[PDB]
Write a protein that binds this ligand. Structure first.
Ligand SMILES: O=C(O)[C@@H](CO)OP(=O)(O)O
Ligand SMILES: O=C(O)[C@@H](CO)OP(=O)(O)O
Ligand SMILES: O=C(O)[C@@H](CO)OP(=O)(O)O
Ligand SMILES: O=C(O)[C@@H](CO)OP(=O)(O)O
Ligand SMILES: [Mg+2]
Ligand SMILES: [Mg+2]
Ligand SMILES: [Mg+2]
Ligand SMILES: [Mg+2]
Lengths: 423, 423, 423, 423
């Protein structure tokens, strides 16, 4: 019986050395499972609340309140539930909290429990996590969207764009795709060295040189792709995370590469890049509440490129539904800790998929050794994952787990390849 | 270990007294599971091949060849595979057969095995079938599309339209929805008696009166809805299965209610009905290869009503993809035995869902006591199922299994209600 | 230990879309079993009470009272009993109810429990149900008495006789017998089509044409038998269920084919049919309390044909004993829900068998996907079963279960054949 | 899995010190069971063959041939069969032997195996033997027909009648019935002492005085009944086993109480006794092949008394069927070792019960400590058992086992009482 018997939590550190929540769930059948919670830097205003202790300890970033919420409220509320009833458990967590934003117990407390319960349920059913969540049909290895040059909120440089990504769409397999990503990454290191630019890493393992702007970064990456003996576009395409909320002034506009710009001028800039570069995807080109901006931008270039809502949707079925109704974006970034339960995450994924939107499972910039999102990408057959440069094991551990899933699937595996980006 | 140890098959009878295939799978861990195969009357030209014995026995409709294919080829080919590797098993079946149409072993032999393996895998994982196939998030109880007045290939009357369906979209729950369907069905019996019309049943448990045509049938059903104290549209909407391939002459047109008509004239007829009746769905309004007809029809009325491809798509990812590319239909009828594996079925469902098409899990007109499709509707969260009148237990057994699933989900259950048909 | 741990019930639908009772029993050893209750249309006055809710819901036919009786009284009364002590459990049910007719808890509540306990006991002993109930000697596959033309209370026609049955007595095996029944059924469809008569089905899956009377129906069936290449009598004999209580006026006589007739005139009619047709069995030729009628009828023709008490005996040892003492009938129709426990059913079967009466296990006209009666026919070695046309899976599922039993018995199986009807 | 793994046999002694067969069966699940074979003195000509060694050893009565047949032929022929498939095992035994009379392996070899397999099957199903053989409905405790004054082939006296029996039909329970039998037995000892007659026991534990004839014996027994404070007839009735084949001369007649008599004169004698004594049953009043004698006798007195075929039927469905067809007897003596399998025994019981004949489970005059027939009487609900005086533990061990069965049934037990003998 996968009946929940114990729920414990502790404070651990994330990939940036900030505290975060880890939860352990034990079932009466002796199943034991552990899940850890990530933490963003460029956090949307509408994200589920991350409960922090404040005061002096860890610069105010302790999570002993979220840990005590798990031990003293959540544990007692879910012991005796069936770990297999994910939705019942998730509803109990949401009702226990009783706020819209999970501001009482914390999204970080609640998600830890949601995720450890799923894992315990999968363990108890003796199914790999991808197969428990995704069923027997879960088989698609995602294109790894690899952020190999970091800026914005992920480094201490003047680069406005947060993430410069390569996408090995042309690879025959995930195992080859990963190798292509690693070879381009190592080539970019050599390119940056030759140019006298920093190979110091940002938060997501990408090089964090202080380059002059967007096109300089994209030129350096295209050189790195060629220098690894791959063709930009056909083998390795480009993608961005502008995280434009980070450079947007409320009711004002976008302070971008030395000027304040309108949504339409930003759209002009992005349309220029499409013309000049093999870009398959642009995430948060405009700010989280710039609904008119996004609608025009999606009208203008959405037929030509994937447009990914992150801070605009925060993995929230209510915000996604508003986007679908308004013709805003054509893809959803899927972050479990933007919404705070697996159930709500899977409702948002269901709403995207049924609305003809693509899905891209995402890390946060503050990650752990947890590889859950590797299993989650295969489960939902997104065919797209965003989990870092092939550097720093909070990123690599997810790619290593995709290797193991691909290996376990055998002839059943399919690499999403260029079928991830029809445009 | 859910390793397949034995695969046996036998000849059973379907709901019309014709032979069909039943398969039993036993796993080394003592798991034992049984699945039966349905059989259509209005079968699309492009359906996976149903292997029949021919000769005198059962009027040529024996399935002893399909049974011997299971015992002598398939069993030996899949014993020692993991029942959890649904895709590997399904690929082995497809490679063993080695034809495009499953014409060597039979779609009926292959599907029996595909379905019994899924069931054994679910049993071994100690998960209800809906949850094994659908994962922990499977929770949506479908609107029952109930075919309560049967014509075309399902009765011996002059009625051209195959299926006249009621859809209790306004019900708060599946258990109430089912009751509304049953109350309307019993009301329609009384209406038909008062009118001196036959209450003899057709193949799908609907009354098979010889009514004058389409609008007469729809008037009789609207009276039955009112007479059960429900509002046509808001509580109980209408749906059709024209099965127009059955009255279509190759390269000629549609012999419909006493005249040969063009695709555009049929479109005119359907548009008229929309004007006059609370119709939410029309299946196969035009023939299986009338690609231009369907494109125009979907252009003309697809914003206003669900348009369901059955014989045009035959649950076939290659035919569905062609439809999506051409703007043909906005929904897929999902029949496991049109394509012959669970894997291929789930690929077609994935392709529809990712293309923004709706999905409706379907019975065949020749059914068994098997309730697999009840679990399959909840698993894929179609929110729509088509499994007969609430009469004849080959139909009712599926509705009884949806009751049990709803009960097992508890507060987690959601009834798809009017959220099944946004138009 | 097959100790009863839980007893739950729910409302499901029968083959006519009316509510009925389903019961689940769980034993401390993890055994879990489910049984559903049938419901008659032509119900004898002396049948155990079927508890109905009344009011608006399901036209007054809800069974939420019977479900609550299971959950709130019966469950608490039998938890901790051994499921193997069938008689103790059945006595507890009968004492808990405390009425002669089971009018307090309902025959439908009580039987659900009686049947689910037997099934749980059989599961726990790891014996097929036929072998648990019948012991190791249970091996006789019954002649399927197949009601392929429905009238009386089972259709909306002017045909007085309820059931027109074919009996493949000449078949070498149950599997061949079933095929003969199906081939005759499909032949009768073609015969009816040629004659311009309805192939709309009645409640038991038989064609429900409005034929002129008894001999017309029997002529149509004899043609169907010949047209399937079988000999009427030697291969396929005929049988009837007059259900004469349905056309009997208290203290008056029998309104039959356009005239009021005496018991003796009805006897004359039946004796005529014997002369003209290969009839092996006639059920309820006279009304449920017409004791003198039956005695004379059994005197007159009982040496020449099987005479089956249904409404006269209602599977009731007290009514059967009265019949045996008076020389009334020579066979008992065995309906579990006429009496309301398995124990009482088996007492009536024991009383018939010890009195030299034959036994015929029967469905009701309102059936479920439950196949218990298939196992019950083999268990008691009746050699006769009445479970419908080989159409509608509430009938076919029983024939499919007889196939599986025959297969499991191997060389041990015997088909009752013509040894079912010595006269 | 109740798969037969080992079959061993040994030579033991019966209640007379003659060798007989004991068989042990072990199943792969660790089930182990033992059964022993009885041996008659007044053996019918048509009995299954009892294999004896001949020569000097045990006066020619060794069974080392039957033991070696078990070890060397039967064991190898049934290892790997399911012990639950009683009929398959019994058919394998009968086919292995391959003779009509079981003259190759011996009825004693074959029955030992048949009986040990049933017991192992019951043990493996964790069901008491009565319940495994009889199903959940087995509940009737038989009237003990107690042979308390022995003559004919069971003692060395001039008394022609083999068995003088008392039947406590008036007792409320088996436990009281047994006490009544024991009290009458002890009273008869005192009566015989007062009369100067022998209290030396015969083979079946009855006193074996050399009394003048039939009426003297019956007078002595009626005195013993009164002297125990019971009423002859209403409390304790009388029964006989004439075993008339023992005093019949082929084609000649019956040498009985000092004269040769015809069947009709014997019938006259028996009719006289009915007039004078509370007799409920007479077994083998005439010889095993005197078919005309029996038919007349059954015509003459069969309405007034139970008439039991023993040597005429030898538990043989073919001989019983001949009797039923000729109106010979109205009851079958059931001796497993007259026919040599449990299956054939149960076919004969089925044939009697379906023919309206009563059934009386019987010991042989050479018994063992085996109590199988106690369980067999309850299983088949005969309501009559014949297993000796309540003296000599080869008889008492069966009565002790009926006590335990009655105790285990609790409120479910019914004592057959006077409902055993309707006449
Ligand atoms: O990308 C960003 O705008 C922020 C918010 O989505 O998150 P992270 O620091 O995890 O990238
Ligand atoms: O609906 C129809 O055209 C046919 C083909 O899809 O099938 P069935 O007889 O099962 O309805
Ligand atoms: O046959 C009939 O008279 C009735 C009563 O026995 O029952 P049913 O509707 O189940 O046939
Ligand atoms: O009663 C008898 O005639 C013989 C034969 O049936 O047997 P037993 O010695 O066992 O009584
Ligand atoms: Mg972002
Ligand atoms: Mg269709
Ligand atoms: Mg009847
Ligand atoms: Mg005898």
């Amino acid at each position: 019986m996968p009946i929940i018997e114990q729920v414990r939590a502790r404070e651990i550190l994330d990939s940036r050395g900030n505290p975060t929540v880890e939860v352990e769930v034990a079932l009466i059948d002796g199943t034991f499972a552990r899940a850890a919670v990530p933490s963003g830097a460029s956090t949307g205003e509408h994200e589920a609340v991350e409960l922090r202790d404040g005061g002096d300890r860890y610069g105010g970033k302790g999570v002993q309140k979220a840990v005590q919420a798990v031990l003293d409220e959540i544990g007692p509320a879910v012991i005796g539930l069936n770990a297999d009833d994910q939705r019942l458990v998730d509803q109990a967590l949401v009702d226990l909290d009783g706020t819209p934003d999970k501001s009482r117990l914390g999204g970080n407390a609640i998600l830890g429990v949601s995720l450890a319960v799923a894992k315990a349920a999968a363990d108890s059913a003796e199914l790999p996590l991808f197969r428990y969540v995704g069923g027997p049909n879960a088989h698609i290895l995602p294109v790894p969207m690899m952020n190999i040059l970091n800026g914005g909120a992920h480094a201490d440089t003047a680069v406005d764009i947060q993430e410069f990504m390569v996408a090995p769409i042309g690879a025959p397999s995930f195992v080859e795709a990963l190798r292509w990503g690693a070879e381009v990454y190592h080539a970019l290191k050599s390119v940056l060295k030759k140019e006298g630019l920093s190979t110091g890493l940002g938060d997501e393992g990408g090089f964090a040189p202080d380059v002059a702007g967007t096109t300089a970064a994209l030129d350096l990456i295209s050189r790195a792709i060629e220098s690894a003996g791959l063709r930009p576009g056909a083998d390795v395409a480009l993608a961005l995370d502008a995280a434009a909320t980070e450079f947007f002034t409320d009711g004002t506009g976008y302070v971008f590469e030395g000027t304040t710009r309108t949504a339409d001028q930003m759209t002009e800039f992005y349309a220029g890049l499409l013309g000049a570069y093999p870009l398959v995807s642009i995430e948060d080109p405009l700010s989280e509440d710039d609904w008119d901006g996004w609608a025009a931008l999606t009208a203008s270039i959405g037929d030509r490129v994937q447009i990914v809502g992150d801070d605009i949707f925060v993995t929230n079925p209510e915000r996604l539904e508003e986007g679908i109704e308004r013709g805003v974006a054509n893809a959803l970034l899927v972050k479990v800790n933007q919404i705070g339960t697996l159930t709500e995450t899977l409702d948002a994924v269901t709403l995207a998929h049924h609305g003809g939107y693509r899905t891209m499972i995402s890390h946060r910039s503050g990650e752990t050794e947890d590889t859950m999102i590797a299993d989650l990408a295969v489960a939902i057959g997104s065919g797209q994952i965003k989990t870092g440069a092939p550097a720093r094991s909070e990123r690599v551990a997810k790619y290593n787990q995709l290797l193991r899933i691909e290996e376990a699937l055998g002839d059943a595996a399919r690499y999403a390849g260029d079928l991830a980006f029809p445009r």
